[PDB]
Amino acid sequence: TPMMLNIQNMMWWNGKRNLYRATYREKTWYEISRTGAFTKGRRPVMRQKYSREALQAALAMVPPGFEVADVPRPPQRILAQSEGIVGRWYSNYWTLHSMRYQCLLAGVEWPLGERQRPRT
């Protein structure tokens, strides 16, 4: 393969194209490379903010017998995002804790448990 032989086969250049390659890339190497956008460091992942009687209804749709500690934080490979309040929103980690933060601001009592740190 010429990519191994290091040929620049770009189509604007000579008209050729590298033969083993995908013809569509929805995000190219630069915007895959930026992990700040993808991972959640220092970034809000839930963009709507609910009023009190909204938060209470959202908490009311959680099935009893549920702990926060049963929802492990996803790895770096997994994109950080929150679909808002959807059905089964408590299965989403970032949604769970973002909601927890609104419940801390609004002075809503938090029915679920809190995150446990297991130690040796």
Binding site: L5, N6, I7, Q8, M10, M11, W12, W13, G15
Partner: peptide, 22 residues
């Protein structure tokens, strides 16, 4: 490609083929 050309200084547009088609 014993030596890589400087391709970073060109904006991307296809040059016309020198044996130009009639």
């Amino acid at each position: 490609i014993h030596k890589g050309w400087r391709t970073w200084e060109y904006q991307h547009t296809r040059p016309d083929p020198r044996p130009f088609p009639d």
